Structure formats: C-alpha cells, structure tokens
Design a protein around this ligand. Structure first.
Ligand SMILES: CS(=O)(=O)NC[C@@H]1CC(=O)N(C2CCCC2)C1
Length: 121
C-alpha cells in the first residue's frame, strides 16, 4: 500500500537520524571501551551478573536492520551499555568512570535528538 511505503520512509528517516545520534554518542567513548560486546571468553561469569548485555556494535547491527521503531527503544539500549557497566565495575575503575562520562556527555546529544524526532515527526 502507499501507507506502508510512507511508514517505511519515516522509519528510514528515523534510522538516518539515529545513525547520526549513534555516531555522536560513540565519539564520547574515545577509549572504545563500549565498542564491542564484553568478551564472554575473557569474562566467563559476565552473564551471571548482567542479564542483558549491550554495546555499540550490537546497537549498530540492530540500527542498520531498521530495528529501532522509535527513539525510546534506541535510548533503552544506550542506557543498557552504561547501566551494565556501572553495576559490574566498581566506582574506582576506568570502566565505571568511562560510563559516567559517556552518560553525561551523551545526555546533551539525546536531549536534542528527542526534540528533532518530535519536530520532524
Ligand atoms: C574493550 S575492553 O575494555 O577490554 N572490554 C570492555 C568491557 C566493558 C566492561 O564492563 N568490562 C569489564 C572489565 C572487567 C570485566 C568486564 C570490560
């Protein structure tokens, strides 16, 4: 139908916007701590602690499959990256501190993204 196609155009546009957001958020992780899944080979107990792992590469895979229907779904995954890290790692670690910095700097990006998704529709 024409309606289906119009919807898919919207989804494609959202994906375009979220691709820009994702690039901006990942730039706030210059250490690349969150670039890839936590290695279950190197951290074999990880899933005993963290029930829903997340990382930027996994987000990008879902993104390019147009798997984020709205900004809320995308933000949920971003929050998983940060929250998983701040639970597994103690406050005095480079990992926890990188997550705090990513959270703080990312808030600015996400605040304007929400306005853009709302504005453009
Ligand atoms: C690229 S990397 O920095 O080598 N690994 C990233 C993960 C993110 C995370 O929370 N990690 C903890 C460190 C203790 C075991 C799991 C390391």
């Amino acid at each position: 139908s024409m309606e289906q196609v119009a919807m898919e155009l919207r989804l494609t546009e959202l994906t375009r916007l979220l691709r820009s957001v994702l690039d901006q958020l990942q730039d706030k992780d210059p250490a690349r701590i969150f670039a890839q899944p936590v290695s279950l080979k190197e951290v074999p107990d990880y899933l005993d602690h963290i029930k829903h792992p997340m990382d930027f590469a996994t987000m990008r895979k879902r993104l390019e499959a147009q798997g984020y229907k709205n900004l809320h779904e995308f933000e949920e995954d971003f929050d998983l990256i940060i929250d998983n890290c701040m639970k597994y790692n103690a406050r005095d670690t480079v990992f926890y501190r990188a997550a705090v910095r990513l959270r703080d700097q990312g808030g600015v990006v996400l605040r304007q993204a929400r306005r853009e998704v709302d504005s453009i529709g």
